[PDB]
């Protein structure tokens, strides 16, 4: 064991070459997911507060080219920002997001084999999953999960944030809300949300305050979280997790995140609020951190000469490229306040 | 007492109008100080790693115009970056900084009445104050104080950081090193350093690691500090100060800072390292924080519609403008990596 400590999580940052095709306009606040060797991309924001399109873009990692998936079936009726998309088996699932006119996307699947959309659930109905934007999503073998986000405004309410998870059982075609973690747990948008070794992790994100003593900043108490909780479906219990380390990341939201084995791997994110909400970029991070969910220790990671610049509001997912599992980062906004079309992959080398 | 908490330190950010005159080129890593209604400016960096000039620029707050002070006497022989300047009585004191060729500025005064420079001390001599760059400075009635910074490289050493304070007794014309705070105290450059209600405060800054277990980032263990110490000249004792608050600022260096009554007031700063040291801007903050040195509580402050953008490596000082004490911020680098000529003043309204 050398005197000087080398970093534990080792890997390489790579910029993914995009050769061409029907390439998506730059975007933030969108959803991506991978099935096999293909990345799917839906939704997005650019310019600020404006949605863009409702095409389903497909990037092939072997050919490094983009195409547009056939727009068959129940094509999603709204072009949205603040949306998310996950993959389970050969289907993609899109939930929520909204446009500037406050119309929210309902719940749809896309069958990548038959190449068709299916409308699955109308949101915001009595006893069903609510309309949400800037929520987070993850999935496992038989569920799509939605955490947090911001609600739809109505006559007698302004939008608020959620602290709940809605779970869609794919085989049964049924939604259920998971146990509510209660008042000590922050309602948040753009939080980290992942299945890791069978359990659900909710971490960091952009929180509603539950304390009138927290002073406002730019007229709102809203702040960046650094808290971490775990839900075990096997027992249906919530626990708050104390995480440690000299390099524990400062409070942040809107970051790339993925699970690789025991690691939660993040990159970028909003570390300071913009004075004008989402109009400007606030302050965005250029750093990557990983949490060992077994030891509960955070450490930064580095990936060689390729260093992605400051960014947040990216789409992210886990995939495997050239036999390496890792964190895929696509799009987002930069400190120039421009959207980017850049795609980066942190390829993990060490054991997980 | 209302249910919802208003901010304690209240004030107004103002952009100081600069009408014209012999206006200084944009710069970071320079020194400013005020005597009466005049701001003095010396040194600076632009482009990265390059010094600029050795003029003493003078801004009159009543006329809002710049001039160049007569270059009489022992004009400082080197154009430097990483320099600092303080005012005591009607004299300015310039210490250190270096140029790209690793020549360091010695210790000079400028007499604002007689309008002449005097060479006071050759640095880096046996038993005397060392050559330093990226040190911090403050002063009181009869002393100029230098804290931290980076040393001059020689044959058998690379530059290192200091954890000591050198104190120049103006009346006696003599330097002395203050008690060394020891190994648990971080050697730092670009740290906060102020006299507050008679005591010396050292806070945050850019630290050398004293633990081979801290992993390197971009090839160096160097990291941003969040520690706070106080030295009382009356007893000659050091104490580490535990500061608190939900809005305690994340680790940072290279920030604007000033003392107003019981408050240490800061703005901006490097919150993430650049991959290439000082070549790029790293990640810079757009937030202001204040520490009540009596209660030891940190809180953010806000100043109305004028919100200075992300910046660090600014020059800063305390002054009074239109009967309001506050924090003066001049120059620095922006997240575009450009230097700025902008000048901002946070005018304090509440009791201190
Ligand atoms: Na394939
Ligand atoms: Na005057």
Swiss-Prot record, chains A, B:
Effect of residue 310 to P: Strongly reduced activity
GO cellular component: cytosol; nucleus
Source organism of this protein record: Thlaspi arvense (Field penny-cress)
Primary role: Specifier protein that contributes to constitutive and herbivore-induced simple nitrile formation. Catalyzes allylthiocyanate and corresponding epithionitrile formation from allylglucosinolate in the presence of myrosinase. Also converts aliphatic glucosinolates, such as indol-3-ylmethylglucosinolate, 4-methylsulfinylbutylglucosinolate, 4-methylthiobutyl- and benzylisothiocyanate, to simple nitriles.
Amino-acid positions noted as binding a (Z)-N-(sulfonatooxy)alkanimidothioate in the UniProt annotation, renumbered to this chain: 50, 98, 133-134, 161, 273, 313-314
Domain of life where this protein originates: Eukaryota
Reaction equations catalysed: (Z)-N-(sulfonatooxy)prop-2-enimidothioate = allyl thiocyanate + sulfate; (Z)-N-(sulfonatooxy)prop-2-enimidothioate = 2-(thiiran-2-yl)acetonitrile + sulfate; (Z)-N-(sulfonatooxy)prop-2-enimidothioate = allyl isothiocyanate + sulfate; (Z)-phenyl-N-(sulfonatooxy)methanimidothioate = phenylacetonitrile + sulfur + sulfate
GO biological process, one term: nitrile biosynthetic process
Gene from which the chain derives: TFP
Stated consequence of mutating residue 277 to L: Modified product profile with increased levels of epithionitrile and simple nitrile at the expense of isothiocyanate and thiocyanate
Phylogenetic placement of the source organism: Eukaryota, Viridiplantae, Streptophyta, Embryophyta, Tracheophyta
Outcome (variant: residue 254 to V): Reduced activity
Covalent S-S links between cysteines: none
InterPro entries, A to Z: Kelch-typ_b-propeller
Tissue specificity note: Expressed constitutively in roots, stems, leaves, flowers, siliques and seedlings.
Protein's recorded name: N-(sulfonatooxy)prop-2-enimidothioate sulfolyase
EC number: 4.8.1.8
Result of changing residue 49 to N: Strongly reduced activity
Influence of pH: Optimum pH is 5.5-6.
Keywords: Iron, Kelch repeat, Lyase, Metal-binding, Repeat
């Amino acid at each position: 064991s050398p005197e000087f400590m080398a970093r534990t999580l080792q890997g390489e940052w790579m910029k993914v070459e995009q050769k061409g095709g029907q390439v998506p306009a730059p975007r933030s606040s969108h959803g991506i997911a991978v099935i096999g060797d293909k990345l799917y991309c839906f939704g997005g924001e650019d310019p600020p507060y404006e949605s863009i399109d409702n095409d389903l873009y497909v990037f092939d990692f072997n050919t490094h080219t983009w195409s547009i998936a056939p727009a068959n079936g129940d094509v999603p009726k709204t072009r949205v920002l603040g949306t998310r998309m996950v993959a389970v088996g050969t289907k993609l699932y899109v939930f929520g997001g909204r446009n500037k006119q406050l119309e929210f996307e309902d719940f749809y699947s896309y069958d990548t084999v038959k190449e068709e959309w299916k409308f699955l659930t109308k949101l915001d109905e009595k006893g069903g999953p609510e309309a949400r934007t800037f929520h987070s999503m993850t999935s496992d073998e038989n569920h799509v999960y939605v955490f947090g986000g911001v609600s739809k405004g109505g006559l007698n309410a302004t939008p608020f944030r959620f602290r709940t998870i809605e779970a869609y059982n794919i085989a049964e075609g049924k939604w259920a809300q998971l146990p509510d973690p209660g008042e000590d747990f922050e309602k948040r948008g753009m939080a980290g949300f992942l299945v890791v070794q069978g359990k659900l992790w909710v971490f960091y994100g952009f929180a509603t305050a539950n304390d009138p003593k927290i002073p406002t900043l730019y007229g709102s108490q809203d702040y960046e979280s650094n808290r971490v909780h775990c839900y075990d479906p096997a027992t249906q219990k919530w626990t708050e997790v104390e995480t440690t380390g000299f390099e524990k990341p400062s409070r942040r939201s809107c970051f790339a995140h993925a699970a690789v084995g025991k690691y939660i791997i993040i990159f970028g994110g909003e570390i300071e609020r913009d004075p004008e909400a989402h109009q400007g970029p606030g302050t965005l991070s250029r750093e990557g951190f990983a949490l060992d969910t077994e030891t509960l220790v955070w450490e930064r990671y580095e990936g060689g000469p390729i260093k992605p610049s400051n960014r947040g509001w990216v789409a992210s997912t886990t995939t495997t490229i050239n036999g390496k599992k890792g964190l895929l980062v696509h799009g987002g906004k930069l400190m120039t306040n421009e959207r980017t079309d850049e795609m980066y992959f942190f390829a993990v080398n060490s054991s997980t």
